[PDB]
Design a protein around this ligand. Sequence first.
Ligand SMILES: *[C@@H]1O[C@H](CO)[C@@H](O[C@@H]2O[C@H](CO)[C@@H](O[C@@H]3O[C@H](CO)[C@@H](O)[C@H](O)[C@@H]3O)[C@H](O)[C@H]2NC(C)=O)[C@H](O)[C@H]1NC(C)=O
Ligand SMILES: *[C@@H]1O[C@H](CO)[C@@H](O[C@@H]2O[C@H](CO)[C@@H](O[C@@H]3O[C@H](CO)[C@@H](O)[C@H](O)[C@@H]3O)[C@H](O)[C@H]2NC(C)=O)[C@H](O)[C@H]1NC(C)=O
Ligand SMILES: *[C@@H]1O[C@H](CO)[C@@H](O[C@@H]2O[C@H](CO)[C@@H](O)[C@H](O)[C@H]2NC(C)=O)[C@H](O)[C@H]1NC(C)=O
Ligand SMILES: *[C@@H]1O[C@H](CO)[C@@H](O[C@@H]2O[C@H](CO)[C@@H](O)[C@H](O)[C@H]2NC(C)=O)[C@H](O)[C@H]1NC(C)=O
Ligand SMILES: *[C@@H]1O[C@H](CO)[C@@H](O[C@@H]2O[C@H](CO)[C@@H](O)[C@H](O)[C@H]2NC(C)=O)[C@H](O)[C@H]1NC(C)=O
Ligand SMILES: *[C@@H]1O[C@H](CO)[C@@H](O[C@@H]2O[C@H](CO)[C@@H](O)[C@H](O)[C@H]2NC(C)=O)[C@H](O)[C@H]1NC(C)=O
Ligand SMILES: *[C@@H]1O[C@H](CO)[C@@H](O)[C@H](O)[C@H]1NC(C)=O
Ligand SMILES: *[C@@H]1O[C@H](CO)[C@@H](O)[C@H](O)[C@H]1NC(C)=O
Ligand SMILES: *[C@@H]1O[C@H](CO)[C@@H](O)[C@H](O)[C@H]1NC(C)=O
Lengths: 387, 385, 397
Amino acid sequence: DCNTKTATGPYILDRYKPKPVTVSKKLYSATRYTTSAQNELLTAGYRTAWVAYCYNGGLVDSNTGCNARLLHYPPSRDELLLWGSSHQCSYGDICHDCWGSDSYACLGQLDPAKHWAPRKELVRRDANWKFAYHMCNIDWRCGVTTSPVFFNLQWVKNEVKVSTLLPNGSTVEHSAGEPLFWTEKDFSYLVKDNFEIQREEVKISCFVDPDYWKKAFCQDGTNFFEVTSHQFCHQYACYNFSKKDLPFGNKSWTVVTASIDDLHALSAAQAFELEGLRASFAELDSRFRQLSEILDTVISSIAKIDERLIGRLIKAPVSSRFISEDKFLLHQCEPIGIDIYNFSALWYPSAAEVDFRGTVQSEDGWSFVVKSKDALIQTMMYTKNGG
Amino acid sequence: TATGPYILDRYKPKPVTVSKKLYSATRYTTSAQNELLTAGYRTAWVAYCYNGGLVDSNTGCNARLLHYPPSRDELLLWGSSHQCSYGDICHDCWGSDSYACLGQLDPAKHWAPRKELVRRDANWKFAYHMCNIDWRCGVTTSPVFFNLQWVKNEVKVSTLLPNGSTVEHSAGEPLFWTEKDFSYLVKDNFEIQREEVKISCFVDPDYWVGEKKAFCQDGTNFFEVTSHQFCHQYACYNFSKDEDLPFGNKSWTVVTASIDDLHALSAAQAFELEGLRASFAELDSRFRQLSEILDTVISSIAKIDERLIGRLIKAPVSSRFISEDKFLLHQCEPIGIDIYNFSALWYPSAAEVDFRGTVQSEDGWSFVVKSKDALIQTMMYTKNG
Amino acid sequence: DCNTKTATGPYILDRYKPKPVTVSKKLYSATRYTTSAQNELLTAGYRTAWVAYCYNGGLVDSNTGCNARLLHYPPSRDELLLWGSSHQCSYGDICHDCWGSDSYACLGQLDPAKHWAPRKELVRRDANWKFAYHMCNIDWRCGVTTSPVFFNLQWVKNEVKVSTLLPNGSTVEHSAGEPLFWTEKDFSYLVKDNFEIQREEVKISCFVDPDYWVGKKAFCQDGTNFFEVTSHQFCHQYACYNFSKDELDLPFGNKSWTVVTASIDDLHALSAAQAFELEGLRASFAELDSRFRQLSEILDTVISSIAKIDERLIGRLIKAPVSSRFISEDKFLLHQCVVDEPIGIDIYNFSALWYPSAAEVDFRGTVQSEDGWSFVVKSKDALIQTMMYTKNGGKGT
Ligand SMILES: *[C@@H]1O[C@H](CO)[C@@H](O[C@@H]2O[C@H](CO)[C@@H](O[C@@H]3O[C@H](CO)[C@@H](O)[C@H](O)[C@@H]3O)[C@H](O)[C@H]2NC(C)=O)[C@H](O)[C@H]1NC(C)=O
Ligand SMILES: *[C@@H]1O[C@H](CO)[C@@H](O[C@@H]2O[C@H](CO)[C@@H](O[C@@H]3O[C@H](CO)[C@@H](O)[C@H](O)[C@@H]3O)[C@H](O)[C@H]2NC(C)=O)[C@H](O)[C@H]1NC(C)=O
Ligand SMILES: *[C@@H]1O[C@H](CO)[C@@H](O[C@@H]2O[C@H](CO)[C@@H](O)[C@H](O)[C@H]2NC(C)=O)[C@H](O)[C@H]1NC(C)=O
Ligand SMILES: *[C@@H]1O[C@H](CO)[C@@H](O[C@@H]2O[C@H](CO)[C@@H](O)[C@H](O)[C@H]2NC(C)=O)[C@H](O)[C@H]1NC(C)=O
Ligand SMILES: *[C@@H]1O[C@H](CO)[C@@H](O[C@@H]2O[C@H](CO)[C@@H](O)[C@H](O)[C@H]2NC(C)=O)[C@H](O)[C@H]1NC(C)=O
Ligand SMILES: *[C@@H]1O[C@H](CO)[C@@H](O[C@@H]2O[C@H](CO)[C@@H](O)[C@H](O)[C@H]2NC(C)=O)[C@H](O)[C@H]1NC(C)=O
Ligand SMILES: *[C@@H]1O[C@H](CO)[C@@H](O)[C@H](O)[C@H]1NC(C)=O
Ligand SMILES: *[C@@H]1O[C@H](CO)[C@@H](O)[C@H](O)[C@H]1NC(C)=O
Ligand SMILES: *[C@@H]1O[C@H](CO)[C@@H](O)[C@H](O)[C@H]1NC(C)=O
């Protein structure tokens, strides 16, 4: 009996309304402090004498024996500057089995800067073969390195300092104009800045997200960082803007070694994010599929009234004639803009290209100190005597 | 003369079958991030000599290091007090004093925060024995990170050793062992918590790889689920019944990552970001194309419906076209139907993962290496002057 | 409604015109060279003798004393081969306090291959307790490892070589059939390739970005390996590539990056870059959802205008046999109850999206972390422990 029609409604077409996400792109003004170079110059030099003063009066004599030890003569600051420029180190006179009056060498002052060499290793000797006499052996080791080492910049009470990174995780703040010099046992160290700190007014792009877990993430060239306060530093750069740990002490992270396990952990976060993006790209593709179905239906409706529409859409010189709901034949027979879309420019991702520096202990300058220690152990392992 | 029939093609993307899930699971976590490692060492240098002149075959020295690693009860006391104990020192003790180098030594007669020995083997008293004894000792109490691990069907604490081995135990049972000069105590000042949770994962049913993969997030932890019973660092998971030889079997927590490995990971990131850039450019091109289609479409209907352009710009205007594109403007509870059927987009977000470092980098374990290096330096030569 | 008389225009509907971004996807043809396996075989062996030849003539005699020293006898290549297969090392005769005529063993050439053991550590002894006689002490250490070590491939003068990675950051390039053998102090080393380099013609997906500057870049994927192509002749880890060309650090002193340890600081910096990009993708996704929101508003208003004329349109959009009747601007009622296929016309001309995917990059660790090379350091450390003091107790005729 469906000669009669029924009526329901009224209805309305739903608009699409996504939950808003607040993160947005800011362009922050900042004063940026950077350096004209990315390395400090570490000059490290060492010098040690082995001094063995022995008396041989036979085993009955309680004075028979040896006073044999290492004595450190670390270079002074002036010496180290000359060692660095000449790539050579200096050492004292060698005494080989000196007895009698010649044995005084082991008792008097030692002049540690009488002979030069690029490197010098000592021989450990404590011979005592001359009965009723003292016997003296002296020999020297020395060496020097001049090596570039990376560094950080750092705010220290409202001024930008160079932060020299030490292999034990401590740091020493200083101005780019004041070299560091210190002595420790056999070694002296000179850290020099052959660069200056330049300041610039810059604009930094950041994404501020008030809905963490309030949090700003920024990019400056190949450097990426989370800005946590208005005075901020990252590696070689400090900024002023406008408007896990305790297993390692408070050691700088530049001396803590990453594990493969840490890389796996970072990799799995990447994997999760990329797969989510994959799922979201699938939904975006689905929306364009849906919009093409809606549009094709809408166009089919208007095109039956306006026989030029299809031709204008494909830029073909044809008018159309429909033979069904969807099938059609084709025959060949300056103003003011109004934006109805109001689209905002997309931010595009790009390859990050982060520079990596490695641990401070990996640097040649600092591993030179470890190599010096290892070589002393080898040469000291046993006496080179007739003893 | 006409051609056709034609039909408007619809856009048909190849389907991509990765989907978001909400999995139910039991999650085992712990109060604290760290175990407590107490490590203490103690060694005596003992040099027992006889000087009968070189004609006597008994002239010479029995000089050596002897280890007295602290017992469990001692290590507990060294831990709480931050001091170590050591025995009597003998400096050139001859005659009746030289017998201190014989028999049993009492290694716990004095206390110090730390103590290093001096190596001496003097023998200068003709016709007498001569005895030198000195001691080294030290203690550290250091937090060290751990993993949880399924053993049989229970969740154990996995203590990580610097050589890449691991020891599984309950959180309640401390580890204690002794090795040469050192004794080691691992205590857990925490308990394992049980909680029912829902974990968001993306399951990709066709993942290739030359051939079914699930990637999950739990807060700041991300992992690939590879079984129903699963652990990732400080947490173990039990999921419902739905859904390198160069290093030996070493725990990856002791293997150092190289800069080369970081470059490999960075290059992966760079490729994916550039592909995302290419895809964003295609997405922008599609919105460009849609705005051209819609403008042509609207311009056709707006000639029929002189109010339409007004509704599109929220204005009370009427329109009159003077050409195909150019126009003038004259001034002047329902049931929802959803024709779009859009699904919520998943949004990414900064994934701030915590890094732990190699076991060997931790202060607790490098204390062992530093004690070894310090003994080499003090033993380098005899102090007989 | 309306007062025609005056205003305004003419106006035109703006089209959306995005700034063009010029990174494009390529399939590059290349010759790829890979290997059957991902490890070389490092055989490393050491052997040393402690030899102490002493004379006791009392302290008045200037020849009283010792010639006590370590003497290295690194295995020959043939020895090393036998050590690796047997998993044993050889060493010479040992002498404990051999005095008088037996001290003869400390003189002349020592034969270092008389005994066998899986491993052997020496005792350091230089006793001299036999007055008016010589005394001889000899002992030996030896050890061997056979371990897999990872390697790179590398182009050397237009051929693919295997690149053996040494723990000091240098590398040795050689053909896969040329084993490496060298001797250094107490150690000899044999590096053997039990694999072949295989050639293959491939197509490689790359994204090429001609607008890539800092102050012309190509990023490729091949399986789980990702690399930036910097030249037509190019290697990445275990693979070398030759791309058709008509189609396209001071603190470490030039060491291979495979020996430079990554810091936690380095990881944080990469992590920070990931975070910035992901929050950018978040913001960009928000703009995408905004655009769909906006399109749904435009389409709804457009459909509302056409549907008043075409009462079947809405029924077709929801796939239902209904005609509509508008009762206001937005509100409407619904009333109910060969031969050739059509030629498709594509007005959209969308290109297929590239979809991201989890990258499962393999990590290799530092060379020094490998068991084969850490064996050398352990050998050195063990020698230091054994040599730390002489074990001269305690005998006498
Ligand atoms: C970066 O850090 C510096 C401080 O180290 C800030 O620079 C300061 O900028 C203010 C402007 O907001 C300057 O104050 C102005 O001084 C002039 C007279 O010199 C006065 O006429 C203005 O009314 C105002 O008081 C101030 O001199 C300047 N400080 C220094 C030491 O030069 C800056 O705000 C920080 N952040 C940025 C630039 O984003
Ligand atoms: C981490 O390492 C740094 C650098 O080695 C340590 O600081 C350094 O400490 C030494 C003492 O061991 C200082 O050398 C000495 O300085 C005094 C004072 O002038 C002098 O009398 C001595 O002759 C000797 O030269 C050295 O100056 C100092 N260096 C710096 C840059 O501060 C630091 O103590 C270590 N931290 C830990 C927790 O081990
Ligand atoms: C890795 O290190 C552990 C801990 O030092 C070693 O296990 C110890 O071995 C000593 C000596 O055999 C025992 O006295 C201890 O009881 C062991 N402790 C534990 C917790 O097991 C283990 O053998 C080492 N493995 C390797 C391959 O070096
Ligand atoms: C890399 O591939 C190219 C192209 O296949 C090789 O080019 C050959 O050598 C020269 C170009 O330098 C020309 O004769 C031809 O382009 C190629 N010759 C032949 C016979 O095809 C190039 O040799 C390859 N590189 C290596 C190292 O094999
Ligand atoms: C890095 O180590 C290699 C191997 O230990 C060094 O080269 C070997 O050592 C000496 C020096 O020339 C030669 O007798 C060997 O034959 C070398 N072998 C090989 C395979 O090269 C090399 O000199 C070291 N490099 C640095 C910069 O220290
Ligand atoms: C459909 O889109 C494609 C772009 O994806 C257009 O094809 C070529 O695009 C490249 C851009 O890399 C240009 O260099 C070419 O000039 C374009 N044309 C041709 C013929 O290759 C194509 O023009 C589009 N088709 C329509 C009808 O708009
Ligand atoms: C256009 O977008 C901006 C920001 O997205 C918004 O502030 C503004 O109100 C919008 N204008 C219209 C007419 O929708
Ligand atoms: C883990 O889940 C499985 C499957 O649901 C089941 O054996 C039980 O619920 C859990 N078992 C344990 C030991 O937690
Ligand atoms: C709407 O929801 C999903 C698409 O995400 C689909 O399963 C369902 O059939 C859709 N219904 C429609 C399009 O009417």
